[PDB]
CSV table of C-alpha atoms in Angstrom, one decimal:
chain,number,residue,atom,x,y,z
A,1206,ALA,CA,84.6,71.0,-15.1
A,1207,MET,CA,82.8,72.3,-12.0
A,1208,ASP,CA,80.4,74.1,-14.4
A,1209,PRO,CA,79.9,72.1,-17.6
A,1210,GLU,CA,77.0,74.2,-18.8
A,1211,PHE,CA,79.1,77.4,-18.6
A,1212,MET,CA,82.0,75.6,-20.4
A,1213,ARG,CA,79.7,74.4,-23.1
A,1214,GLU,CA,78.1,77.8,-23.7
A,1215,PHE,CA,81.4,79.6,-23.5
A,1216,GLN,CA,83.2,77.2,-25.8
A,1217,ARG,CA,80.6,77.8,-28.5
A,1218,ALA,CA,81.2,81.5,-28.3
A,1219,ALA,CA,85.0,81.1,-28.2
A,1220,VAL,CA,85.1,78.8,-31.2
A,1221,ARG,CA,83.0,81.3,-33.2
A,1222,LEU,CA,85.4,84.1,-32.2
A,1223,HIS,CA,88.5,82.1,-33.1
A,1224,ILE,CA,87.1,81.1,-36.5
A,1225,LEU,CA,86.7,84.8,-37.3
A,1226,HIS,CA,90.1,85.7,-35.8
A,1227,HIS,CA,91.7,83.1,-38.0
A,1228,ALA,CA,89.8,83.9,-41.1
A,1229,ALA,CA,90.6,87.5,-40.8
A,1230,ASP,CA,94.4,86.8,-40.7
A,1231,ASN,CA,94.3,83.9,-43.3
A,1232,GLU,CA,92.3,82.0,-45.9
A,1233,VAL,CA,91.5,78.7,-44.2
A,1234,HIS,CA,90.4,75.2,-45.1
A,1235,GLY,CA,88.2,73.5,-42.6
A,1236,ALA,CA,90.6,70.6,-42.2
A,1237,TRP,CA,93.2,73.0,-40.9
A,1238,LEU,CA,90.7,74.9,-38.7
A,1239,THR,CA,89.9,71.7,-36.9
A,1240,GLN,CA,93.7,71.2,-36.1
A,1241,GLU,CA,94.3,74.8,-35.1
A,1242,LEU,CA,91.3,75.0,-32.8
A,1243,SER,CA,92.4,71.8,-31.3
A,1244,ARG,CA,95.9,73.4,-30.7
A,1245,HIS,CA,94.1,76.2,-28.9
A,1246,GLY,CA,92.3,73.8,-26.5
A,1247,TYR,CA,88.9,73.4,-28.2
A,1248,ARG,CA,87.3,70.0,-28.9
A,1249,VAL,CA,85.6,70.4,-32.3
A,1250,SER,CA,84.4,67.8,-34.9
A,1251,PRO,CA,83.6,68.2,-38.6
A,1252,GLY,CA,80.0,67.6,-37.4
A,1253,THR,CA,80.2,70.8,-35.3
A,1254,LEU,CA,82.5,73.0,-37.3
A,1255,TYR,CA,81.1,72.9,-40.8
A,1256,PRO,CA,77.6,74.0,-39.8
A,1257,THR,CA,79.1,76.9,-37.9
A,1258,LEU,CA,81.1,77.7,-41.0
A,1259,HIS,CA,78.0,77.6,-43.2
A,1260,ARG,CA,76.1,79.7,-40.7
A,1261,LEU,CA,78.8,82.4,-40.5
A,1262,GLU,CA,78.7,82.5,-44.3
A,1263,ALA,CA,74.9,82.7,-44.2
A,1264,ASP,CA,75.2,85.6,-41.7
A,1265,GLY,CA,77.6,87.3,-44.3
A,1266,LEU,CA,80.6,87.2,-41.9
A,1267,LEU,CA,82.5,84.6,-44.0
A,1268,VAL,CA,82.7,83.9,-47.7
A,1269,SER,CA,83.8,80.5,-49.2
A,1270,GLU,CA,85.1,79.8,-52.6
A,1271,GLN,CA,85.6,76.6,-54.4
A,1272,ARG,CA,89.2,76.8,-55.7
A,1273,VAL,CA,91.2,74.5,-57.9
A,1274,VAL,CA,94.8,74.6,-56.9
A,1275,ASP,CA,97.4,72.2,-58.0
A,1276,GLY,CA,94.8,70.0,-59.7
A,1277,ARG,CA,92.6,69.6,-56.6
A,1278,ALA,CA,89.3,71.4,-55.8
A,1279,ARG,CA,89.0,72.8,-52.3
A,1280,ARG,CA,86.8,75.1,-50.3
A,1281,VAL,CA,88.6,78.0,-48.6
A,1282,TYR,CA,86.9,80.4,-46.1
A,1283,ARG,CA,87.7,84.0,-45.4
A,1284,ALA,CA,86.3,87.0,-43.4
A,1285,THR,CA,84.2,89.6,-45.2
A,1286,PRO,CA,84.3,93.2,-44.2
A,1287,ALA,CA,81.3,92.5,-42.1
A,1288,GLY,CA,83.2,89.6,-40.5
A,1289,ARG,CA,86.1,91.9,-39.5
A,1290,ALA,CA,83.6,94.4,-38.0
A,1291,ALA,CA,81.9,91.5,-36.1
A,1292,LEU,CA,85.3,90.4,-34.8
A,1293,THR,CA,85.9,93.8,-33.3
A,1294,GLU,CA,82.5,93.9,-31.7
A,1295,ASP,CA,82.8,90.3,-30.4
A,1296,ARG,CA,86.2,91.2,-28.9
A,1297,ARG,CA,84.8,94.3,-27.3
A,1298,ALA,CA,82.2,92.2,-25.6
A,1299,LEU,CA,84.9,89.9,-24.3
A,1300,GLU,CA,86.9,92.8,-23.0
A,1301,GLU,CA,83.9,94.2,-21.1
A,1302,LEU,CA,83.2,90.9,-19.4
A,1303,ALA,CA,86.9,90.5,-18.6
A,1304,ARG,CA,87.0,93.9,-16.9
A,1305,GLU,CA,83.8,93.3,-14.9
A,1306,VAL,CA,84.5,89.8,-13.5
A,1307,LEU,CA,88.2,89.9,-12.9
A,1308,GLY,CA,88.2,92.8,-10.3
A,1309,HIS,CA,79.7,94.9,-3.3
B,999,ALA,CA,75.0,93.8,-33.7
B,1000,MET,CA,77.2,92.5,-36.5
B,1001,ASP,CA,77.2,89.1,-34.9
B,1002,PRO,CA,73.9,88.4,-33.2
B,1003,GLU,CA,74.6,84.7,-32.7
B,1004,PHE,CA,77.8,85.4,-31.0
B,1005,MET,CA,76.1,88.0,-28.8
B,1006,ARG,CA,73.3,85.6,-27.9
B,1007,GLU,CA,75.6,82.7,-27.1
B,1008,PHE,CA,78.0,84.9,-25.3
B,1009,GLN,CA,75.4,86.6,-23.2
B,1010,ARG,CA,74.2,83.2,-21.9
B,1011,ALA,CA,77.7,82.5,-20.6
B,1012,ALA,CA,78.2,86.0,-19.3
B,1013,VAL,CA,75.0,86.0,-17.4
B,1014,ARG,CA,75.8,82.7,-15.7
B,1015,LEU,CA,79.2,84.0,-14.7
B,1016,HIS,CA,77.9,87.2,-13.3
B,1017,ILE,CA,75.3,85.4,-11.2
B,1018,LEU,CA,78.1,83.4,-9.6
B,1019,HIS,CA,80.3,86.4,-9.2
B,1020,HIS,CA,77.6,88.3,-7.4
B,1021,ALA,CA,76.4,85.4,-5.3
B,1022,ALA,CA,79.9,84.7,-4.1
B,1023,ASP,CA,80.3,88.3,-2.8
B,1024,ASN,CA,76.9,88.2,-0.9
B,1025,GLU,CA,73.4,86.9,-0.7
B,1026,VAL,CA,71.1,88.1,-3.5
B,1027,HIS,CA,67.4,88.2,-4.4
B,1028,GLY,CA,66.5,87.6,-8.0
B,1029,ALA,CA,64.8,91.0,-8.2
B,1030,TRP,CA,68.0,92.7,-7.3
B,1031,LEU,CA,70.0,90.5,-9.7
B,1032,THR,CA,67.8,91.6,-12.6
B,1033,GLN,CA,68.6,95.3,-11.8
B,1034,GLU,CA,72.3,94.7,-11.3
B,1035,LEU,CA,72.9,92.7,-14.5
B,1036,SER,CA,71.0,95.4,-16.2
B,1037,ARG,CA,73.4,98.0,-14.8
B,1038,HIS,CA,76.2,95.8,-16.2
B,1039,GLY,CA,74.8,96.0,-19.7
B,1040,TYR,CA,72.9,92.6,-19.9
B,1041,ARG,CA,69.3,92.5,-21.1
B,1042,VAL,CA,67.5,90.1,-18.8
B,1043,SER,CA,64.0,89.7,-17.4
B,1044,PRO,CA,62.8,87.7,-14.3
B,1045,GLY,CA,61.3,85.4,-17.0
B,1046,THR,CA,64.8,84.7,-18.3
B,1047,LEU,CA,66.8,85.0,-15.1
B,1048,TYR,CA,64.9,83.0,-12.5
B,1049,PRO,CA,65.1,79.8,-14.6
B,1050,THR,CA,68.8,80.2,-14.7
B,1051,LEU,CA,68.8,80.7,-11.0
B,1052,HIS,CA,66.9,77.5,-10.5
B,1053,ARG,CA,69.2,75.6,-12.8
B,1054,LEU,CA,72.3,76.8,-11.0
B,1055,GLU,CA,70.8,75.6,-7.8
B,1056,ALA,CA,70.0,72.2,-9.5
B,1057,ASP,CA,73.6,72.1,-10.7
B,1058,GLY,CA,74.7,72.6,-7.1
B,1059,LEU,CA,76.5,75.9,-7.8
B,1060,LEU,CA,74.0,78.0,-5.8
B,1061,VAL,CA,71.8,77.3,-2.8
B,1062,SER,CA,68.6,79.2,-1.9
B,1063,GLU,CA,66.9,79.8,1.4
B,1064,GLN,CA,63.4,80.8,2.1
B,1065,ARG,CA,63.4,83.6,4.5
B,1066,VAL,CA,60.5,85.6,6.0
B,1067,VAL,CA,61.8,89.1,6.6
B,1068,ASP,CA,59.7,92.0,7.6
B,1069,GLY,CA,56.4,90.2,7.1
B,1070,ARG,CA,57.3,88.9,3.6
B,1071,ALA,CA,58.6,85.5,2.3
B,1072,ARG,CA,61.7,85.9,0.1
B,1073,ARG,CA,64.2,83.6,-1.5
B,1074,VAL,CA,67.9,84.5,-1.3
B,1075,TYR,CA,70.6,82.8,-3.3
B,1076,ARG,CA,74.2,82.3,-2.5
B,1077,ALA,CA,77.3,80.4,-3.9
B,1078,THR,CA,78.1,77.0,-2.6
B,1079,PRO,CA,81.6,75.7,-2.3
B,1080,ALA,CA,81.2,74.1,-5.7
B,1081,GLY,CA,80.0,77.4,-7.0
B,1082,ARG,CA,83.1,79.2,-5.8
B,1083,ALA,CA,85.2,76.5,-7.4
B,1084,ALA,CA,83.2,76.9,-10.6
B,1085,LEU,CA,83.7,80.7,-10.5
B,1086,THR,CA,87.4,80.3,-10.4
B,1087,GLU,CA,87.4,77.8,-13.3
B,1088,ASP,CA,85.0,80.0,-15.4
B,1089,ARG,CA,87.1,83.1,-14.7
B,1090,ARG,CA,90.3,81.2,-15.7
B,1091,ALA,CA,88.7,80.2,-19.0
B,1092,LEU,CA,87.7,83.9,-19.6
B,1093,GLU,CA,91.2,85.1,-18.8
B,1094,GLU,CA,92.7,82.6,-21.3
B,1095,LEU,CA,90.4,83.6,-24.1
B,1096,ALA,CA,91.1,87.3,-23.4
B,1097,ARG,CA,94.9,86.8,-23.6
B,1098,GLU,CA,94.6,84.8,-26.9
B,1099,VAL,CA,92.1,86.9,-28.9
B,1100,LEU,CA,93.6,90.2,-28.0
B,1101,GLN,CA,97.1,89.8,-33.2
């Protein structure tokens, strides 16, 4: 990376957006989210990811639920209404920057 | 803002990218960059912006030049070769995220 600071800042924003994107389509376990973000080209650790998850929930954008399924307790995450609205707004911001910088 | 944390993180990235975008086109003063980023919808002060400018120069992505013009000393910034390469990479990353996140 010629600009590691940019990549770092930008990756934090992109991860956040992908989490909402995925949690709007699906209920998600964190284990799975790590794999899926990795598929999308993002390096993420449990160390990085769960605190974001917790913070999104604290911001009211996600909600988590302890759920016993098939004799095993797990936490699932999903978007709240506010989270869907946030996703739209966050996307809008990305669209604007895309329009500006990809065309004095 | 439904997602202030996102906006905050994202604005840091967007400001950085705009600085390079503008400094690749032409030479720029920081006073002017404040106005121009403000035109583009980014809330920035000299207090916020100049440190970014200094940091980009320290990262080798910009270079500045003291110039005395019309009886007054001013600093102009421009992209270095490494900054143009960075610009391309940073744009690429933005295009990819755009394509992905726009079901």
